[PDB]
Amino acid sequence: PESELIRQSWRVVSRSPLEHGTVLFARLFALEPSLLPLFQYNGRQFSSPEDSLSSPEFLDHIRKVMLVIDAAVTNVEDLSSLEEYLTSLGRKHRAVGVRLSSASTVGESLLYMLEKSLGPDFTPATRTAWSRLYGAVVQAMSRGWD
Ligand code: HEM
Protein backbone atom coordinates (compact mmCIF):
# COMPACT_ATOMS: atom_id res chain seq x y z
CA PRO A 1 0.00 0.00 0.00
CA GLU A 2 2.91 2.25 1.06
CA SER A 3 4.80 0.94 -1.98
CA GLU A 4 2.10 2.65 -4.11
CA LEU A 5 2.52 5.84 -2.03
CA ILE A 6 6.22 5.76 -2.94
CA ARG A 7 5.58 5.10 -6.66
CA GLN A 8 2.88 7.84 -6.79
CA SER A 9 5.08 10.49 -5.10
CA TRP A 10 8.18 9.66 -7.04
CA ARG A 11 6.25 10.12 -10.32
CA VAL A 12 6.19 13.89 -10.00
CA VAL A 13 9.86 14.30 -9.07
CA SER A 14 11.19 11.63 -11.41
CA ARG A 15 10.10 13.76 -14.41
CA SER A 16 12.71 16.45 -13.65
CA PRO A 17 15.36 14.64 -11.70
CA LEU A 18 18.05 17.34 -11.95
CA GLU A 19 15.79 20.19 -10.79
CA HIS A 20 14.58 18.12 -7.93
CA GLY A 21 18.00 16.72 -7.02
CA THR A 22 19.31 20.27 -7.08
CA VAL A 23 16.85 21.03 -4.23
CA LEU A 24 18.14 17.96 -2.40
CA PHE A 25 21.81 19.03 -2.65
CA ALA A 26 21.18 22.68 -1.88
CA ARG A 27 19.37 21.59 1.25
CA LEU A 28 22.19 19.18 2.09
CA PHE A 29 24.87 21.80 2.00
CA ALA A 30 22.71 24.21 3.94
CA LEU A 31 22.42 21.59 6.67
CA GLU A 32 25.98 20.17 6.57
CA PRO A 33 28.37 22.50 4.79
CA SER A 34 31.31 20.22 5.69
CA LEU A 35 30.17 17.82 2.91
CA LEU A 36 31.04 20.35 0.17
CA PRO A 37 34.80 19.48 0.08
CA LEU A 38 34.18 15.84 -0.56
CA PHE A 39 33.42 16.68 -4.22
CA GLN A 40 36.87 16.88 -5.59
CA TYR A 41 36.90 17.14 -9.27
CA ASN A 42 39.90 18.25 -11.26
CA GLY A 43 41.75 18.14 -7.89
CA ARG A 44 39.88 21.30 -6.76
CA GLN A 45 37.55 22.04 -3.82
CA PHE A 46 34.31 24.05 -4.23
CA SER A 47 34.46 27.20 -2.04
CA SER A 48 30.73 27.75 -1.77
CA PRO A 49 27.61 25.69 -2.32
CA GLU A 50 26.64 27.72 -5.36
CA ASP A 51 30.01 26.75 -6.96
CA SER A 52 28.88 23.09 -7.06
CA LEU A 53 25.85 23.97 -9.12
CA SER A 54 28.10 25.30 -11.93
CA SER A 55 30.01 22.01 -12.13
CA PRO A 56 29.07 19.49 -14.87
CA GLU A 57 30.53 16.72 -12.83
CA PHE A 58 28.60 17.69 -9.74
CA LEU A 59 25.34 17.96 -11.66
CA ASP A 60 26.13 14.54 -13.15
CA HIS A 61 26.40 13.20 -9.69
CA ILE A 62 22.90 14.56 -8.91
CA ARG A 63 21.60 12.54 -11.86
CA LYS A 64 23.42 9.42 -10.47
CA VAL A 65 21.80 9.92 -7.05
CA MET A 66 18.34 10.22 -8.55
CA LEU A 67 18.94 7.15 -10.75
CA VAL A 68 19.76 5.07 -7.66
CA ILE A 69 16.71 6.33 -5.83
CA ASP A 70 14.64 5.46 -8.91
CA ALA A 71 16.10 1.93 -8.73
CA ALA A 72 14.96 1.59 -5.10
CA VAL A 73 11.47 2.80 -6.03
CA THR A 74 11.43 0.26 -8.88
CA ASN A 75 12.38 -2.43 -6.39
CA VAL A 76 10.47 -1.09 -3.41
CA GLU A 77 8.81 -4.53 -2.96
CA ASP A 78 12.07 -6.45 -3.64
CA LEU A 79 15.14 -4.65 -2.35
CA SER A 80 17.05 -7.78 -1.45
CA SER A 81 17.84 -7.49 -5.15
CA LEU A 82 19.89 -4.22 -4.72
CA GLU A 83 21.72 -5.42 -1.63
CA GLU A 84 25.01 -6.10 -3.38
CA TYR A 85 24.94 -2.93 -5.56
CA LEU A 86 24.21 -0.75 -2.48
CA THR A 87 26.81 -2.45 -0.35
CA SER A 88 29.46 -1.51 -2.93
CA LEU A 89 28.06 1.99 -3.32
CA GLY A 90 28.61 2.35 0.43
CA ARG A 91 32.21 1.10 0.08
CA LYS A 92 32.77 3.74 -2.68
CA HIS A 93 31.48 6.59 -0.51
CA ARG A 94 33.51 5.42 2.48
CA ALA A 95 36.48 5.73 0.13
CA VAL A 96 35.63 9.27 -1.00
CA GLY A 97 35.33 10.19 2.67
CA VAL A 98 31.67 10.30 3.48
CA ARG A 99 30.94 9.34 7.11
CA LEU A 100 28.02 6.95 7.59
CA SER A 101 26.63 9.53 10.05
CA SER A 102 26.03 11.88 7.11
CA ALA A 103 23.50 9.44 5.63
CA SER A 104 20.78 10.78 7.94
CA THR A 105 21.36 14.35 6.67
CA VAL A 106 21.00 13.04 3.15
CA GLY A 107 17.76 11.41 4.27
CA GLU A 108 16.48 14.63 5.77
CA SER A 109 17.40 16.42 2.50
CA LEU A 110 15.48 13.90 0.42
CA LEU A 111 12.43 14.16 2.70
CA TYR A 112 12.76 17.96 2.48
CA MET A 113 12.77 17.90 -1.33
CA LEU A 114 9.76 15.56 -1.41
CA GLU A 115 7.84 17.76 1.08
CA LYS A 116 8.55 20.93 -0.97
CA SER A 117 7.61 19.20 -4.25
CA LEU A 118 4.44 17.43 -3.03
CA GLY A 119 3.04 20.20 -0.84
CA PRO A 120 -0.42 19.16 0.39
CA ASP A 121 0.22 15.71 -1.09
CA PHE A 122 3.14 14.76 1.25
CA THR A 123 0.98 13.16 3.88
CA PRO A 124 2.47 11.71 7.05
CA ALA A 125 2.08 8.13 5.69
CA THR A 126 4.07 9.39 2.69
CA ARG A 127 6.88 10.67 4.93
CA THR A 128 6.85 7.41 6.88
CA ALA A 129 6.98 5.32 3.71
CA TRP A 130 9.98 7.25 2.38
CA SER A 131 11.68 7.21 5.80
CA ARG A 132 11.47 3.44 5.85
CA LEU A 133 12.62 3.04 2.22
CA TYR A 134 15.56 5.38 2.62
CA GLY A 135 16.41 3.67 5.92
CA ALA A 136 16.44 0.37 4.07
CA VAL A 137 18.73 1.78 1.43
CA VAL A 138 21.07 3.04 4.06
CA GLN A 139 21.04 -0.34 5.92
CA ALA A 140 22.24 -1.95 2.66
CA MET A 141 24.89 0.71 2.03
CA SER A 142 26.14 0.54 5.63
CA ARG A 143 27.36 -3.00 5.03
CA GLY A 144 29.93 -1.22 2.79
CA TRP A 145 31.38 0.67 5.83
CA ASP A 146 32.91 -2.62 7.20
C1 HEM B 1 26.71 13.23 1.38
C2 HEM B 1 26.27 12.67 0.27
C3 HEM B 1 27.06 12.30 -0.91
C4 HEM B 1 28.29 12.68 -1.34
C5 HEM B 1 29.21 13.64 -0.63
C6 HEM B 1 28.55 11.92 -2.53
C7 HEM B 1 29.74 12.03 -3.22
C8 HEM B 1 30.07 11.23 -4.30
C9 HEM B 1 31.28 11.27 -5.00
C10 HEM B 1 32.43 12.19 -4.68
C11 HEM B 1 31.23 10.36 -6.03
C12 HEM B 1 32.33 10.13 -7.01
C13 HEM B 1 32.44 11.28 -8.03
C14 HEM B 1 31.36 11.26 -9.06
O15 HEM B 1 30.99 10.21 -9.65
O16 HEM B 1 30.80 12.33 -9.31
C17 HEM B 1 29.98 9.72 -5.97
C18 HEM B 1 29.55 8.78 -6.87
C19 HEM B 1 28.24 8.30 -6.86
N20 HEM B 1 27.25 8.62 -6.00
FE21 HEM B 1 27.37 9.84 -4.46
N22 HEM B 1 27.52 11.12 -2.83
C23 HEM B 1 26.59 11.30 -1.91
C24 HEM B 1 25.36 10.66 -1.86
C25 HEM B 1 24.84 9.80 -2.83
C26 HEM B 1 23.60 9.16 -2.76
C27 HEM B 1 22.60 9.34 -1.63
C28 HEM B 1 23.50 8.35 -3.90
C29 HEM B 1 22.40 7.45 -4.31
C30 HEM B 1 21.37 7.19 -3.54
C31 HEM B 1 24.67 8.51 -4.66
C32 HEM B 1 24.97 7.86 -5.86
C33 HEM B 1 26.23 7.91 -6.44
C34 HEM B 1 26.58 7.08 -7.65
C35 HEM B 1 25.65 6.14 -8.42
C36 HEM B 1 27.85 7.33 -7.93
C37 HEM B 1 28.76 6.74 -8.98
C38 HEM B 1 29.72 5.80 -8.11
C39 HEM B 1 30.63 4.79 -8.77
O40 HEM B 1 30.18 3.66 -9.10
O41 HEM B 1 31.84 4.99 -9.01
N42 HEM B 1 25.45 9.36 -3.95
N43 HEM B 1 29.24 10.29 -4.91
In the chain, domain spans = 1-146
Distances in whole angstroms, Cα of residue 25 to Cα of each of 16, 71, 110, 123: 15, 19, 9, 23
Residue 20 known to bind ligand: no
Instruction: Measure the CA angle with vertex 27, ends 103 and 110; round to 5°.
Output: 50
Name the DSSP class of 145.
G
CA of 120 to the centre of ligand 1 (A): 30
- Does the annotation place 61 within a ligand binding site? yes
- For this PDB entry, the determination method is X-ray
- Say how many Å lie between the CA of residue 38 and the centre of ligand 1: 10
Radius of gyration of the chain (CA): 15
Question: What is residue 48's DSSP assignment?
Answer: S
Does ligand 1 come within 6 angstroms of the Cβ of 127? Answer: no
